[PDB]
Write a protein that binds this ligand. Structure first.
Ligand SMILES: *[B]([O])([O])[C]([C]C1=[C][C]=[C]C([C][C])=[C]1)[N]C(=O)[C]([C]C1=[C][C]=[C][C]=[C]1)[N]C(=O)C1=N[C]=[C]N=[C]1
Ligand SMILES: *[B]([O])([O])[C]([C]C1=[C][C]=[C]C([C][C])=[C]1)[N]C(=O)[C]([C]C1=[C][C]=[C][C]=[C]1)[N]C(=O)C1=N[C]=[C]N=[C]1
Lengths: 199, 219, 236, 213, 242, 229, 230, 214
């Protein structure tokens, strides 16, 4: 898997590949790893499929009731703490990383890391097996003040670059743009991926 | 096992073989791997036969209590969730790999549920030791909005490829077609092996077996 | 009539008669006086004898090196509360390696003793305490009651005839902060003796003193150890 | 796999005299080939007539020490008297055996006065077996100092020798000379020697220096 | 109605009432008056803390508490119940930060604590709290917020609020103020004036005034009103009475 | 909770709370059960207070499993508790034995729960009497379970308001050899004996049980039965 | 009805008040603390010649240096006696020493208001017994009294039971702090003879003396006869 | 935590005349990977105490949460009593030992610096409950590289000024960046004096690579 989130002025862009594997076998080649936790709050799934889906199901439930009690959309910090606490309490039994990003009236567009029960805000963040091969790329390619389109292009290029190199990553790139107005869903097909040196 | 699913223009087709194996020995030549959940929801089981049998039985029973209370036809999302949350809780020790297919107010759906509790909504899928032979046929010839006759044909071929290619699979192809109007359970829809014939002359003349003791209890 | 039986029953007046009945235990225990100066906290109490042949009951008990108490009421409830206090103090030194701040201990007593005032089949504590302590905020005198309410005091008296002692503490209140130990203890003895009958005086048998302060850990003086303080008293 | 123990070294030693008891220790605390601190004395004052030496895993040393400290206060409140040296020894055995299946990795040597005002030493193993001794060494250089205590303080292997009982002055000189030898040969012993002397008058502490390496 | 219908909170009277809660409300009405005012840049609390004995220390029986760094609580009623509710409220705020990583919103805290109160109004096993209390808070995002909970477990949001003996008399005096356009420095002087007016010098003994505030002036932190400002408000309160 | 019984023996030897629970039943809307030769009918008065009530929203005649059905007299909310419990009990049997629960077996299990509320601490007995119908071993069954936890197998019976008259009416009016088509007609005529007003397909509720399992009759089916009445 | 933990308008628990009244029905027992040891004496109150006098054990040994005299409900006392014996041996095990008389008295005393209905694990009512703990420790000979309120006090001389008022009056007139243990035994026997309805004899009463260097001793019939002779 | 994930390297500490200074790089490593090069590993506990942490970051964040709340809890009372640096060190020792005894340690090695009543405080606490005070501390690999330099200076001059202590810490961070293969040239310097705790960052030590031309 290769997951990625990028903050911009009015919100966030989140991306993921589409490969679900079981050893060297592709089980699902078109999985959408960008799972909604609330209207305007999403998480990118990685690691154990069963663990990631379980944590997402519980976080969306906790956040739904939290939102209805505060008579307000939950804060992205609250959604990040929700996921983080589950990942931390069960870190010995869970083997999943759920990146949390979205939008708020208070702090606007924010990107969070939940790796092993930790919590960290990032201008952009990457995860999954595929992220290992694009650290140098994202370090060279990231520039602050990127537009939502520039964020989608940074996310698409970085994920395609990882998809080529990583056996556990491939398929299609799913893009999601969370903003005050709402959420936009894009899909970049395996035919339409950006091309780079592949020999 | 070779279990498979498909989503066609008017519903879902579920396919299964009839082999149960006990360590390289065929124990059953014709078992039923396609199980009822609700009138318009069926499930294929692969793995530890007792785990597939009991987790299908439990969710079917939970769906009867669901439908009786709600007064509505059950949703395929409910069977997927009830199954996942149960399997996840057991952490993969309940070895049931399932293909859930069905039709509700939101159309036809096909899901793959794994023993650890992970799931996927797919247009076609295959599970079991012969899943790769079936998944090759499905990848090779699946087109969206297939006709019932075209979908049945592809499904039979997908299960058959697993029957002949996987040593852990054999027997006949059982199928189930699920449409808005209900489900048609096509048992032994295809038999890739013609009736096995022998020149069996193994008759024993009465008395050939040496008997030491004989007691007769009238009933 | 019907609002007397349980602590969970509110009377139509917005009163809890069981709490009021438990407070009657404190008023029936023998007088105790607690007072403080800028450096010390003193506990002076009268010890009753159940016959000439019996001994005068222990009215003052140790809680920690910086805290000591004097009881009035059910002696079994006083022991229960004493061991809770002693233990809370032990926990604080085990965990933090510092004395438990006196006001914090008193909050735990108020929190601990309120619980049975709101639970059916349970009863309030039939004990009232005077607490003497010393910490970073100097010396303290606190008062707890069978009603889970507590008070920060400049001086105080609980028990039988304690109204007489309270009057002396209110009239001499101003002199207490600049008092030395001998004078502060004597003030305590005079308030204690005001409760005592007209025919009865203080004694090296019925008097008990507890002192904690700037350099002194909580110490209990009882018979010949009490004599130096009584040797200053002079009148009525 | 996580190990809940680590060896922090250090040497303890006690001697019971006619009217005194000495409990002594080095001040080194280490781990592996590193020195944590050079000022870590292993002597802990429990009562005005009882001192304890503790050595082994420092985490267990700190804990068993706070538990002993808390238990004495509890006993004083319950009995309105200080625990005698014998009652502290008997109690420590039960505390150590309460962890029979997850031991306190601590070597304890109690030293103080008995009810006759004489010297008392009680030595323990991590799991709670103890006995009263004339003298004893524990900790990293335990095996270096014990044979010399057996010889010079117990008069062992010496025929035609006048058995003169040890005086405080003579025992203090022996503690200072054995810790110098322990610091020369045992890597875990050094920096300084902290000596606790228990007499009718109370506890005195003396601190002599040992090698910094 | 003394016919058994008033001995338990798990028993309704024939006219549909729970008398155990009504008798618990009477314990607050018998107690000293506490007032709270919400203004343009914060919330201010004031309490008529009657001096039961000259022997007690200045600041004994504090009827004002810090429930969280940004939340304050003003009580009236049975003090041990009031302090037990302060500990519940405190833990509720503490548990929100541990769950969501930020300060508990005041309406949410009011809602949570009001339901721990409500819970004690349903059973024979437990007794309702003989207490009413106010919660005050200020943040840039939520603004100034004042809430009040009664023994029944009811929680409402207020611009001005009073609880205790003089609850109605203090209300007709708070109504004279145009608090929606006032500062906390301005409203402090008024809170003291209202407490001195509703105090009964004949029936009651001496009193001590407790003043606390949370607003923009304090950076959203619940604080006691400093000695300097308190003396100035008490001087104006006494001068206005004449 | 309250750990002591709330139903105790009066000095005369009566379990008075059970007697008072039976009074709640005797004041409820009437219900009828008729065991035909080839099936079972369950009929009840579903007359609500006003036109404003959505009659189609809640039911009195309820399914338990494919072959068992239910009706009651008394406390509506109490009934719902027993319906859920009965449906659950029917699944527990099916999960173990892989066979539809025999009606005597369901009735016995449910009746045990009813007995429990007459002895267990701090609870009152159910104010409901249930008519349970089923089809098993190729034959129809009609049972009744009352607030004490006692069960009875009936050929035909009445519960609720005017049950004494309905029970005499059933005895004389019809007997064995009834076709299910004849039995439904009789159940509706038994109900017409107590009913105050015009009896429509929205104020009466019928359920049938036969070879094809149990099912509630549609209002159009009830309308055609009422066309002959 | 009212709960067992209900307070009377005077500030005392009704159940504890009534448990004290039960002691007024029990056999009269006396204890005298002397410089030479503590003396314990009790009337058995035998109701039939067929009853074995040896089977009435109202004076018990808690440990070698501590004895106990009891009055009230004899069966309620048996539970607290065992709690006292267990306590001394758990203290011996943990600390390698004997307990003070006061420490044992305090241990038994902690179990007094440990009764209740709601929120408990589980005594329903208090113990209808009064105890006298006579023994020797480093503080010398000590005699302690305890009642169902958990209140324990140290006594020079104390009487408990039916004729408590009268026996204490007699004790008060004859007790001196310098009185010998021989005189202590004589006074207790004379005072016990006075208060009982039946005549006094070696098989009618129990006598025990705890003295430093002699330990706890239960007087034999032959010893009781020699004492009654004087 | 039986197996740490994101870990922090050495935490440095040295007391001076009038306070204590503590230093730590802002790196969280996942094995050899410098995964987070800008995370703070230092925390202001209260006005007199500050804590730096080596080992697992998720466990440090958890302790930062638990401590942070304890401070808030205390401050609501406003009774004129506050946790001394020594009391935070005592609590933290009991906290680590307790988790270690349940065979579920918090994978950290921490340094606590403080200043209360004119006295400087510097205490070490590890995942097993081993605690002690020292004039200078260095956790992890710093116990091999930086502790010899701190002790070398403290041997010549035992009392250091705030400036001398600060320059000594900058010299130690330069050595650690050269020698520790799990360090980063981004760090924080936190100082506690009469005024209170002051955390400074991000800092970097200038590097010299002239030895490459030898
Ligand atoms: B990814 O490679 O990390 C992917 C992410 C993921 C998360 C939630 C839900 C899904 C699909 C249901 C996928 N996870 C996987 O592909 C993992 C295997 C994996 C994990 C880590 C690195 C590489 C590969 N898939 C499973 O665990 C799984 N899927 C199907 C059947 N059994 C197990
Ligand atoms: B299949 O080959 O994976 C098969 C699935 C199966 C078998 C019989 C009935 C059902 C109904 C749901 C399903 N599983 C087996 O044959 C298993 C052994 C196995 C396990 C994993 C991979 C391949 C094969 N066999 C049994 O559990 C079994 N065999 C005979 C009788 N009882 C049980």
């Amino acid at each position: 898997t290769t997951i990625m989130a990028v903050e911009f002025d009015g919100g966030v862009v989140m991306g993921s590949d589409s490969r679900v594997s079981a050893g060297e076998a592709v089980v699902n080649r078109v999985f959408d790893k960008l799972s909604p936790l609330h209207e305007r709050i999403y998480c990118a799934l990685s690691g154990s499929a069963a663990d990631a889906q379980a944590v997402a199901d519980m976080a969306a439930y906790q956040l739904e009731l939290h939102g209805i009690e505060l008579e307000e959309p939950p804060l992205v910090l609250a959604a990040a703490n929700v996921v983080r606490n589950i990942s931390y309490k069960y870190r010995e039994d869970l083997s999943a990383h759920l990146m949390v990003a979205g939008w708020d009236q208070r702090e606007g567009g924010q990107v969070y890391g939940t790796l092993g029960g930790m919590l960290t805000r990032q201008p952009f963040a990457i995860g999954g097996s595929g992220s290992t091969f694009i650290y140098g790329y994202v370090d060279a390619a990231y520039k602050p003040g990127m537009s939502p389109e520039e964020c989608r292009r940074f996310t698409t290029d970085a994920i395609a670059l990882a998809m080529s190199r990583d056996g556990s990553s491939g398929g299609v790139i799913y893009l999601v743009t969370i903003t005050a107005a709402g959420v936009d869903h894009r899909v970049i097909l395996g035919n339409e991926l950006p091309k780079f040196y592949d020999e | 096992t070779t279990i498979a699913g498909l989503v066609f223009q008017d519903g879902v087709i579920l396919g299964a073989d009839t082999r149960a194996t006990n360590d390289s020995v065929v124990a059953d030549k014709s078992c039923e791997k396609i199980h009822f959940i609700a009138p318009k929801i069926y499930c294929c089981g692969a793995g530890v036969a007792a785990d597939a049998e009991m987790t299908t039985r439990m969710v079917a029973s939970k769906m009867e209590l669901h439908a009786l209370s709600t007064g509505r036809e059950p949703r395929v999302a409910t069977v997927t969730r009830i199954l996942r949350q149960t399997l996840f809780r057991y952490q993969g020790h309940v070895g049931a790999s399932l293909i859930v297919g069905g039709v509700d107010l939101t159309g036809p759906q096909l899901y793959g549920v794994h023993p650890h509790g992970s799931y996927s909504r797919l247009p076609f899928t295959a599970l079991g030791s012969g899943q790769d032979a079936a998944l090759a046929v499905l990848e090779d010839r699946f087109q969206p909005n297939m006709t019932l006759e075209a979908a049945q044909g592809l499904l039979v071929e997908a299960v058959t490829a697993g029957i002949l290619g996987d040593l852990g699979s054999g027997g006949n192809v059982d199928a189930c077609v699920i449409t808005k109007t209900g489900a048609k359970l096509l048992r032994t829809l295809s038999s890739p092996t013609e009736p096995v014939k022998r020149s069996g002359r193994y008759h024993f003349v009465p008395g050939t077996t040496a008997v030491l003791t004989q007691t007769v209890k009238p009933l | 009539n019907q609002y007397d039986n349980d602590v969970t029953v509110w009377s139509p007046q917005g009163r809890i008669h069981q709490i009021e009945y438990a407070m009657e235990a404190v008023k029936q225990g023998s007088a105790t006086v607690g007072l403080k100066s800028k450096t010390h906290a003193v506990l002076v109490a009268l010890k009753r004898a159940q016959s000439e042949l019996a001994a005068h009951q222990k009215k003052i008990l140790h809680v920690d090196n910086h805290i000591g108490i004097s009881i009035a009421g059910l002696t079994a409830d006083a022991r229960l509360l004493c061991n809770f206090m002693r233990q809370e103090c032990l926990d604080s030194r085990f965990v933090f390696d510092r004395p438990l701040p006196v006001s914090r201990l008193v909050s735990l007593i108020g929190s601990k003793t309120q619980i049975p005032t709101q639970r059916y089949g349970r009863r309030p504590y039939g004990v009232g305490l005077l607490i003497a302590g010393y910490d970073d905020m100097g010396p303290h005198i606190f008062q707890t009651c069978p009603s889970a309410n507590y008070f920060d005091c400049r001086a105080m008296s609980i028990g039988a005839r304690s109204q007489s002692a309270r009057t002396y503490l209110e009239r001499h209140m101003s002199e207490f902060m600049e008092c030395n130990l001998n004078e502060l203890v004597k003030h305590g003895l005079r308030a204690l003796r005001e409760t005592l009958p007209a025919e009865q005086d203080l004694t090296t048998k019925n008097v008990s003193i507890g002192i904690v302060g700037k350099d002194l850990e909580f110490t209990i003086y009882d018979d010949d150890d009490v004599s130096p303080f009584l040797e200053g008293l002079e009148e009525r | 796999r996580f190990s809940p123990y680590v060896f922090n070294g250090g040497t303890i030693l006690a001697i019971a005299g006619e009217d005194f008891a000495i409990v002594a220790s080095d001040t080194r605390l280490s781990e592996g080939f590193s020195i944590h601190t050079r000022d870590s004395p292993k002597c802990y004052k429990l009562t005005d007539k009882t001192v304890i030496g503790c050595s082994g895993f420092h985490g267990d040393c700190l804990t068993l020490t706070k538990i002993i400290e808390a238990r004495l206060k509890m006993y004083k409140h319950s009995n309105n008297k200080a625990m005698t040296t014998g009652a502290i020894a008997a109690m420590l055995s039960t505390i150590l055996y309460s962890r029979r299946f997850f031991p306190y990795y601590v070597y304890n040597i109690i030293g103080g006065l008995d009810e006759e005002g004489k010297g008392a030493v009680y030595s323990f193993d991590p799991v709670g077996s103890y006995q009263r001794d004339s003298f004893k060494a524990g900790g990293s250089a335990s095996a270096m100092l014990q044979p010399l205590l057996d010889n010079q303080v117990g008069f062992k292997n010496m025929q035609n020798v006048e058995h003169v009982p040890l005086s405080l002055d003579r025992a203090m000189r022996l503690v200072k000379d054995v810790f110098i030898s322990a610091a020369e040969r045992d890597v875990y012993t050094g920096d300084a020697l902290r000596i606790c002397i228990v007499t009718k008058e109370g506890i005195r502490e003396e601190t002599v220096s040992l090698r910094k390496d | 109605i003394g016919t058994g219908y008033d001995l338990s909170a798990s028993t309704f009277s024939p006219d549909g009432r729970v008398f155990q809660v009504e008798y618990a409300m009477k314990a607050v009405e018998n107690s000293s008056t506490a007032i709270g005012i919400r203004c343009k840049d914060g919330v201010v609390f004031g309490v008529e803390k009657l001096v039961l004995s000259k022997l007690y220390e200045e600041g004994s029986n504090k009827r004002l508490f810090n429930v969280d760094r940004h939340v304050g609580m003003a009580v009236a009623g049975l003090l041990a119940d009031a302090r037990s509710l302060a500990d519940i409220a405190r833990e509720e705020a503490s548990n929100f930060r541990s769950n969501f990583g930020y300060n508990i919103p005041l309406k949410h805290l009011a809602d949570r604590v009001a339901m721990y109160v409500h819970a004690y109004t349903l059973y024979s096993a437990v007794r309702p709290f003989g207490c009413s209390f106010m919660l005050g808070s200020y943040s840039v995002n939520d603004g100034a917020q004042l809430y009040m909970i009664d023994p029944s477990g009811v929680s409402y949001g207020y611009w001005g609020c009073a609880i205790g003996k003089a609850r109605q008399a203090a209300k007709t005096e708070i109504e004279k103020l145009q608090m929606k356009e006032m500062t906390c420095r301005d409203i402090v002087k008024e809170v003291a004036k209202i407490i001195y007016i509703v105090h009964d010098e004949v029936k009651d003994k001496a009193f001590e005034l407790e003043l606390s505030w949370v607003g923009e002036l304090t950076n959203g932190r619940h604080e006691i009103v400093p000695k300097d400002i308190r003396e100035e408000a008490e001087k104006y309160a006494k001068e206005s009475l004449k | 909770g309250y750990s002591f019984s709330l139903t105790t023996f009066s000095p005369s030897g009566k379990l008075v709370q059970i007697e008072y629970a039976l009074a709640a039943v005797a004041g409820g809307a009437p219900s009828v059960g008729i065991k035909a030769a080839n099936g079972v009918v369950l009929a009840t008065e579903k007359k609500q207070k006003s036109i404003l009530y959505d009659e189609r929203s809640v039911h009195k005649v309820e399914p338990i499993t494919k072959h068992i059905g239910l009706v009651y007299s008394g406390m509506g909310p109490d009934y719902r508790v027993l319906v859920h419990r009965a449906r659950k009990l029917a699944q527990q049997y099916y999960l173990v034995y892989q066979e539809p629960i025999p009606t005597a077996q369901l009735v016995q299990r449910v009746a045990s729960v009813m007995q429990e509320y007459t002895q267990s601490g701090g609870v009152r007995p159910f104010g409901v009497s249930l008519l349970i119908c089923g089809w098993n071993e190729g034959r129809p069954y009609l049972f009744q379970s009352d607030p004490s936890g006692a069960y009875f197998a009936w050929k035909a019976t009445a519960m609720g308001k005017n049950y004494v008259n309905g029970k005499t009416f059933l005895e004389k009016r019809y007997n064995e050899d009834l076709e299910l088509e004849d039995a439904i007609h009789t159940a509706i005529l038994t109900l017409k004996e107590s009913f105050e007003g015009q009896m429509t397909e929205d104020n009466i509720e019928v359920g049938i049980c036969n070879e094809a399992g149990f099912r509630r009759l549609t209002p159009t089916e009830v309308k055609d039965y009422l066309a002959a009445i | 009805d009212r709960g067992v933990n209900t307070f009377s308008p005077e500030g005392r628990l009704f159940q504890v008040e009534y448990a004290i009244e039960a002691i007024k029905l029990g056999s009269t027992a006396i204890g005298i603390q002397t410089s030479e040891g503590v003396c314990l004496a009790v009337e058995k109150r035998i109701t039939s010649p067929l009853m074995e006098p040896s089977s009435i054990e109202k004076i018990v040994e808690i440990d070698a240096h501590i004895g106990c005299a009891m009055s009230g409900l004899i069966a309620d006392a048996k539970t607290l006696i065992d709690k006292a014996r267990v306590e001394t041996q758990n203290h011996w095990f943990t600390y390698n020493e004997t307990m003070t008389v006061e420490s044992v008295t305090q241990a038994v005393s902690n179990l007094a208001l440990q009764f209740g209905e709601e929120d408990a694990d589980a005594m329903s009512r208090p113990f209808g017994v009064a105890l006298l703990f006579g023994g020797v420790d480093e503080k010398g000979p000590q005699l302690f009294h305890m009642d169902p309120s958990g209140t324990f006090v140290q006594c020079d001389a104390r009487a408990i039971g039916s004729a408590s008022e009268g026996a204490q009056s007699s004790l008060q007139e004859v007790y001196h702090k310098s009185m010998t243990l021989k005189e202590a035994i004589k006074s207790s026997l004379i005072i016990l003879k006075q208060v009982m309805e039946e005549k006094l004899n070696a098989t009618n009463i129990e006598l025990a003396t705890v003295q430093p260097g002699q330990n706890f001793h239960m007087f034999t019939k032959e010893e009781l006869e020699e004492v009654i002779k004087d | 935590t039986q197996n740490p994930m994101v870990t922090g390297t050495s935490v440095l500490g040295v007391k001076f005349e009038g306070g204590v200074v503590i230093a730590a790089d802002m790196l969280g490593s996942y094995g050899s990977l410098a995964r987070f090069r800008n995370i703070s590993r230092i925390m202001r506990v209260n006005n007199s105490t500050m804590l730096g942490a080596s080992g697992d970051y998720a466990d440090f964040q958890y302790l930062k949460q638990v401590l942070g709340q304890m401070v808030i809890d205390e401050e609501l009372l406003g009774d004129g009593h506050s946790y001394s640096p020594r009391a935070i060190h005592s609590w933290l020792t009991r906290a680590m030992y307790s988790r270690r005894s349940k065979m579920n340690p918090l994978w950290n090695t921490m340094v606590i610096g403080g200043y209360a009543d004119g006295e400087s405080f510097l205490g070490y606490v590890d995942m097993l409950g081993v605690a002690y005070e020292a004039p200078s501390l260095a956790t992890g690999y710093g116990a091999y590289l930086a502790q010899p330099l701190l002790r070398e200076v403290l041997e010549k001059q035992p009392v250091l000024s705030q400036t001398e202590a600060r320059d000594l810490v900058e010299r130690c961070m330069r050595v650690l960046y050269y020698r520790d293969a799990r360090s980063y040239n981004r760090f924080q310097i936190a100082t506690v004096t009469e005024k209170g705790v002051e955390i400074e960052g991000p800092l970097s030590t200038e590097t010299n690579w002239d030895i490459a031309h030898m």
